[PDB]
Amino acid sequence: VYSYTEKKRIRKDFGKRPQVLDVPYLLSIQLDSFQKFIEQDPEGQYGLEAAFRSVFPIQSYSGNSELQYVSYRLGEPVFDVQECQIRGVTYSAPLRVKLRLVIYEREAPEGTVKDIKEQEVYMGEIPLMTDNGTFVINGTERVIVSQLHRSPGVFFDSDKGKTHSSGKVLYNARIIPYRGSWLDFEFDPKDNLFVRIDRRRKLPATIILRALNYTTEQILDLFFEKVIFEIRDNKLQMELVPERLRGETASFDIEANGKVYVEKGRRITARHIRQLEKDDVKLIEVPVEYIAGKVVAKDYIDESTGELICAANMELSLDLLAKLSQSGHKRIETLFTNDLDHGPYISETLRVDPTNDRLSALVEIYRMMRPGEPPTREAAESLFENLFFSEDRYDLSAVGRMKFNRSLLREEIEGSGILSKDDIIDVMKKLIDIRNGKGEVDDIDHLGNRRIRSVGEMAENQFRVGLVRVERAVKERLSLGDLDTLMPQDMINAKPISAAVKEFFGSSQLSQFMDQNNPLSEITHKRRISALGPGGLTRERAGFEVRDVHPTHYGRVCPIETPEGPNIGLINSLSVYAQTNEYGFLETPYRKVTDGVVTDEIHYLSAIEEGNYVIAQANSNLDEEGHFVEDLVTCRSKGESSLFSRDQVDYMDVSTQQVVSVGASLIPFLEHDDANRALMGANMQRQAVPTLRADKPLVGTGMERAVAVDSGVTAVAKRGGVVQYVDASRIVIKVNEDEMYPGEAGIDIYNLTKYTRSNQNTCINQMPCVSLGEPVERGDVLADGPSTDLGELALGQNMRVAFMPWNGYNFEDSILVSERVVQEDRFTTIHIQELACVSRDTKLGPEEITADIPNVGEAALSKLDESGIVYIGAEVTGGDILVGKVTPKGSDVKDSSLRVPNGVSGTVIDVQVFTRDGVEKDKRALEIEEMQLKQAKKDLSEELQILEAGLFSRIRAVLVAGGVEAEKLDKLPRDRWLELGLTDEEKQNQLEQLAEQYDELKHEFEKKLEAKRRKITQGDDLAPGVLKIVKVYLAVKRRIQPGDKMAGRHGNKGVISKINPIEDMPYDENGTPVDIVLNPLGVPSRMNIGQILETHLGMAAKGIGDKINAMLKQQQEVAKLREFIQRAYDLGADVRQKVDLSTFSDEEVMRLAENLRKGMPIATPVFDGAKEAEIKELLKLGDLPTSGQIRLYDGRTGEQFERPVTVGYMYMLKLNHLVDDKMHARSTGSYSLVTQQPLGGKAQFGGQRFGEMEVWALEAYGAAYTLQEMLTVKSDDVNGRTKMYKNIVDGNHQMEPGMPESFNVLLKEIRSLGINIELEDE
């Protein structure tokens, strides 16, 4: 079964693997994020409720008043989106917050407040999101791009080689909070442990332990295990668990139980450890040279004399043993400092530490953090207890606590946001374990260690900044609060929240201007994952590995769609199937594989879960049950693509598109292209201009439908049904009854956006693709947008291309084009330019909008009214006048009248004017007022009458259970209708019910039309300051010409060189010329062989189209057409499509065959595409030669090209790098102010920067005079250039050079220091 615009032109779909999961809604990142931001979500997470439950209730410092929260709301926007783009306002909503002030008496923590007050106060306006994922910030339509940043939680990084210049590795460990202070631990090459906070000075790390109220003995209890020396019969024996001897040299005689176990000299092996454990060896008598290097663990004091023997962490000598042995401390605890495993890093750090107690530790930390200003007990304790341990200024989020517990192998995943003692101690223990050998480092490119911020998270963080500023303001006003004479807007202020949130949505590194020239380009700028932005890395610094593709990108980030240039691999684009995790990570779908049978259930994984499992490949042959048909299958285990068994796998890839994105999965035959040319192909495919006549890629991938629907450029039907099709203004859809609400009778009226300006000066235009009285279903398309054709996606157009050298005109990458391409207007794109004119009151009175243009004669008053401003629509070019806008006292009058820029033509399509309340010239301002005034009422009544007509009929329709008397129901016409009483019978309240409808309709229409006139009757609506605001919309129509840039989908760039006549083209023996000749020499080097298979398969597609065009032109009854269409849709191997063609009612075969006579469209999916034998077999169904190559004659000489050439249909696109936006020349005009050199650019009429390497190139020749005029006369020296212009126009090519002006600018800037630079003797 198919929908009704699916039976229009059903694309022949190759593809063997049955898809199990359909493509998700391609704009779901932006929409789900911002729907999380604004939503009334009780339990607080996440959203605006999290912000209000963090900041509220505010209580002041015992001020006995506590403003609390109830509920918030967003009212209607005062401007809908279209008039918002027209006017220039933000597309925002007012944020109505209920606030409840309660005020206490004296001594009321528990006492009832003395008075309350509560109001729906107004703070800020937040910009809402349009239904397509965009904002409208100041008239322009912008997009917030999702950031990719390091997750909160600990990271164990190495930096193995570069420091110390000695090959000794370090190991640092960064505890990155979501909000607050950064804490880093790091080794130094003396093997000492150092802490630093916020990249400040370096403190030896155990001082932070001494800041957490840990004595030295507790620290040594933590990071070291005790070795027990017992004072015994002789020589102070040792408890020895045999694990501690692993891998060391036996220094002494190892004997016990009257038996010599291990002698001196040999290293202790694990067999000797087994001997000591089997022989149960713990207590052995040591020599005195064994204890002479060890370190004591805890303190010991001489008991009778009452003083200290040794401090904790003290190495032992023999006389120290003579001190402690004679006192009476029988147990001696020593620190086991294994040189292999258990290193003495904490102990040597304690030897570096200049502190001894907690208080000096806090004083040293306070002298680190805030220097100069003294370190007192209260100040240092408040500093360190609010560094990490308070809920205000340090907060690992839920993501941070999950990563923090996961990297430390904790059991739980939810905990408190602040740190604790045990967390810092665990980070130090894991860092020490990594130094010892056990456990390993983390990498930073691993996408399980890399979170995504999106629109709702970033706007929530900015909103929380605004709320903490307004709570500091509320704490300010409340302690100065006098009661009861204030209500909660003398306390609260709508200014900082609105200021912060407009600061982010206006001027941020991620709220950026939408690339809008293409449905693809909109939908792939919204799905963008940037590494840049605040808190992330920069373009000009880093690096090599963060610009590189890591094995966790499989199915999360597109490997091949990243922009080439200064930021490669920072501006990654998101994959097709990849959602976003609850915590913000990238989870991608996989198919759960319990046993041999691959189950059709899906299950989402992130990269910290994808490593543990074994995940199969998308294309591994499985037949009729899910069993892998091989006994071994390529999978990947832990980022390593390897071959595993038939029955080990736990997951399989869902579909074979899932590695790449929606820009580079529209490229058919992707798997045959090179990676570089697929990158260049996707990046150019974003840049296509919408042509005037949209044309359906013959070789597509089938993802055109999802991109053209999911990007909101087409008018997808909301509720299904039929159609009324007024359409000149709007599509009117009558709704079928099942999808139709009981009240609100209701028919859907779709607004078509006709010719208007895009963000890239292209033309966004919608055209209805459904006729009158034609069924449509829910989700079906109704109006084709820019670059769409019946709901598909038509960026460029499909043309007949020959691969051959043709007389040098396609030399390096150039492209030689027939005249049949430029006669048919099949690339003639439409550009629209907005031009503003304002008459601001700079000085010496205000400027004026009058045709009475001066000095200039009857060459001003022409394309305008009898007395001012461009009329409506003519063929204006360059140097014309659009808006007469000149002042007197500015003879002394002048010409600021905004004219048409140099080189452009066009038609004035629209003139907008919300000017300084007064613009009316003669009486036009109020003349149109009456026109709109009468317009509103007309439609208002019309619509009511339209429904009235439907209701009147409905009244009679229902009039059967309570008066069906046809001859007794046609009484009053426009007066009443029902003069009976149904009462009940079988409930037809229905008459009374419909009576209310009409009664309310007229009653509401009056009020509806009442406000209409009110709105109509007005000067105009805009902001203040600016006075004369005239915007004129030109529309140039640019065709194609030698110098434009065209390109296919594979990376084959080209500058169209010669626009040949039709005759000189290479025609085949049938007679048709070829349209575009490309060059075969690009194909062996640039290894993008997919354009040839697209060429052959498009040739086969148009072969079927020519065959259907013959069978339908030379008209046959529909049996032969349905037989040939059925053969065309069966065609070859096992596919997914076949068709159910004998259910197309003998007319939907014919409408399909009317839409196929330009070529049968073929879906070649991304990595499961059409094989070559099917291309040959399809070329045999059409009557074309199997090789794909036709013999071609030459249009010049009439004689055959030897060795037959390739002709086919490639889908070639016109990129928006047009040659009459690049052509520029300058002889003489205006310059800058500071310098005497020419200005730069094209919009400024400026000259070429003759840069540094060109000066070196002229020095490389003997061009001393060319360089002398190149930097003195042509550029800078003012006397030289005026003398040169007069010398040229006299006929004397001679320069009088002088000295450059910018060098005298250099002399004054150097001399304006204390520097006396001069110019010496003659």
Binding site: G808, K1045, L1081, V1083, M1223, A1225, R1226, G1247, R1249, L1306
Partner: protein, 653 residues
């Protein structure tokens, strides 16, 4: 200056000076009022920091800022940096009489001229047109002429063709790296908006036609027109200054047209017929009686100039093809016939132009470079040399090679389950057998492409080199190598992960067969690393050129002989393999220090101050001379410069 609006966008120096003056006024008032010590110490300290911030901002602790957090730019920051006065306004300036547009080909050009649009030509040459209009007498005042060219009447285009005619322009591609990136042409006017640029010259500019742009500059004065014609003209730059190699080498279409033209096949139309000249060879090709490659005895008359500047004719019958005679109609007089008798790839056509330049000089080499380009484009058009899907011939032996490699990795992993071998030796054995299988697949496809054609002539079969399209694009050296044609037919090797180590499972599928998902992802590892390397490598390459031209910067050839006898000892370099760079590459065109003894005994073979051009180097190679003591630039005795002998040959002259 105010921007568009009603406020003044003020500079940063006005903030700095206004703060110094505010603080200085405060300090004068406090020294009037006799404030105490700590007040005037803070006041003078704030003045000290204000002055120090004005002069060089940010050299003291964190720099001051106005809007918003960005520091404001001081005087020293108007001098230093990439955007100071030296690097931004004094070494490089913006320039009047200049233009810029997208380039395109136009292959009808001669290599001293380029196409230049009419709209750019009327804008760049406004003062010359004004002077011409005022000379004729059509108008009077200057205003009238500016109205005439603002209206663009019917008479200013003849004025424009009379100001263009002998007036060169400097075309310049935007990343100019060496001196061949600024070359002077003569304009030919173009209906259009794109600069038509002669194709051979593109290999000098590194200019393809994928969207490139070039700037045009006009030499205004008369000495600059003469410098553009006599030093910077495109006919004058036919040798690269880095070496002796020609830079007007025919690049890609034209070598395919020649390689298809001068070749042969074992049977064609007109096999083994005899022809009385090259003129009727082209007449037999055009009428349709022979083929472009059909072996044939012709009678050619080659002019060998064996006397002292006299050209002696020798005519003979060469067993050659039809295409070699047609290409002999374009070769100038002095070159022998054996320069076209071979197959003419790209190295052979480069040494054809090089031998033409060494024998017949400059003007026949310019006109012969143009005739090469014209006949290459014309017969490449007549060739119809496409590319198909059938041209990439899969080896029939490829699948059995892959199965033998799969059996070998199966044996190695069965040893790995039983622990007989180590892990590093396993990884080494797997990379070794996949390298061996890769080389065998490449040899299978290379035999299957280089001799696939087997056509009979009058009897049994006989083999020859193939006319496969991708093989001529590879063998001609137009575009393609062994590796790229290997990746389109044989397996595309063992791609490496970004860890730097190789991956033990290769990409056994080429591009004609489909890559599956994992193989394309490993390919994307290997290609993303290359794009990141180029896009970050270019910064270090440019900064290296900057440091080199600023250490050089001064050194000018300023004498004719320093009068020394010292110079470095040029030997051929040998690393331990076969002799890498011969002595004729190192002592070509460098003046000897003392006179080289002939290797027999004590003979004056060459004198002690002779430039060693090609004739001297051939008389050095005949005598097998050991090593030459030659004069080097580092031994030059000239104060402030390098003498003319210790440099050497001009290299492009």
């Amino acid at each position: 200056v105010p921007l568009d609006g009603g406020r003044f966008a003020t500079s940063d120096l006005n903030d700095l000076y206004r703060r110094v003056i505010n603080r200085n006024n405060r300090l004068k008032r406090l020294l009037d009022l006799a404030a105490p010590d700590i007040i005037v110490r803070n006041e003078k300290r704030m003045l000290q920091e204000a002055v120090d911030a004005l002069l060089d901002n940010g050299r003291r602790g964190r720099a001051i800022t106005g809007s918003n957090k960005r520091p404001l730019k001081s005087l020293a920051d108007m001098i230093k940096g990439k955007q100071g006065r030296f690097r931004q306004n004094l070494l490089g300036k913006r320039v009047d009489y200049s233009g810029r547009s997208v380039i395109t080909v136009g292959p009808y050009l001669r290599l001293h001229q380029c196409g230049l649009p009419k709209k750019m030509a009327l804008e760049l040459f406004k003062p010359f047109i004004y002077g011409k209009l005022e000379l004729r007498g059509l108008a009077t005042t200057i205003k009238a002429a500016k109205k005439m060219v603002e209206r663009e009447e019917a008479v200013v285009w003849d004025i424009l063709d009379e100001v263009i005619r002998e007036h060169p322009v400097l075309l310049n591609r935007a990343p100019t790296l060496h001196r061949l990136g600024i070359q002077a042409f003569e304009p030919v006017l173009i209906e259009g908006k794109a600069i038509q640029l002669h194709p051979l010259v593109c290999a000098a500019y590194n200019a393809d036609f994928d969207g490139d742009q070039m700037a045009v500059h006009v030499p205004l004065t008369l000495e600059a027109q003469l410098e553009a014609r006599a030093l910077m003209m495109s006919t004058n730059n036919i040798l690269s200054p880095a070496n002796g190699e020609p830079i007007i080498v025919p690049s890609q279409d034209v070598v395919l047209g020649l390689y298809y033209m001068t070749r042969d096949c074992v049977n064609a139309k007109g096999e083994g017929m005899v022809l009385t000249g090259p003129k009727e060879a082209e007449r037999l090709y055009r009428s349709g009686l022979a083929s472009l490659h059909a072996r044939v005895k012709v009678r050619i008359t080659e002019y060998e100039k064996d006397a002292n500047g006299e050209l002696v004719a020798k005519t003979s019958l060469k067993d050659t093809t039809v295409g070699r005679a047609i290409l002999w109609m374009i070769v100038p007089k002095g070159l022998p016939y054996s320069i076209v008798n071979q197959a003419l790839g790209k190295k052979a056509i480069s040494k054809m132009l090089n031998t033409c330049y060494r024998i017949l000089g400059l003007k026949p080499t310019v006109i012969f470079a143009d005739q090469i380009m014209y006949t290459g484009f014309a017969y490449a058009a007549r060739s119809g040399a496409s590319v198909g899907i059938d041209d990439m011939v899969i080896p029939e032996k490829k699948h059995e090679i892959i199965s033998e490699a799969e059996a070998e990795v199966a044996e190695i992993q069965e040893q790995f389950q039983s622990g007989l071998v180590t892990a590093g030796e396993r990884y080494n054995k797997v990379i070794d057998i996949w390298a061996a299988a890769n080389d065998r697949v490449s040899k299978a496809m290379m035999d299957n492409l280089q001799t696939e054609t087997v056509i009979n002539r009058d009897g049994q079969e006989e083999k020859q080199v193939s006319f496969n399209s991708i093989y001529m694009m590879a063998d001609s050296g137009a575009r393609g190598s062994a590796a790229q044609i290997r990746q389109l037919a044989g397996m595309r090797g063992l791609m490496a992960k970004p860890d730097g180590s190789i991956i033990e499972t290769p990409i056994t599928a080429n591009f004609r067969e489909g890559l599956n998902v994992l193989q394309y992802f490993i390919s994307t590892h290997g290609a993303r690393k290359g794009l990141a390397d180029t896009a970050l490598k270019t910064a270090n390459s440019g900064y290296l050129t900057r440091r080199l031209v600023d250490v050089a910067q001064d050194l000018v050839v300023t004498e004719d002989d320093c009068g020394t006898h010292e110079g470095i000892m040029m030997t051929p370099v040998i690393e331990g393999g076969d002799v890498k760079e011969p002595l004729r590459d190192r002592v070509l065109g460098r003046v000897t220090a003392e006179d080289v003894l002939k290797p027999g005994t004590a003979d004056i073979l060459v004198p002690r101050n002779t430039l060693l051009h090609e004739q001297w180097c051939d008389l050095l190679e005949e005598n097998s001379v050991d090593a030459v003591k030659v004069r080097s630039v580092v031994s030059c005795d000239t104060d402030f410069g390098v003498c003319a002998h210790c440099y050497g040959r001009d290299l492009a002259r």
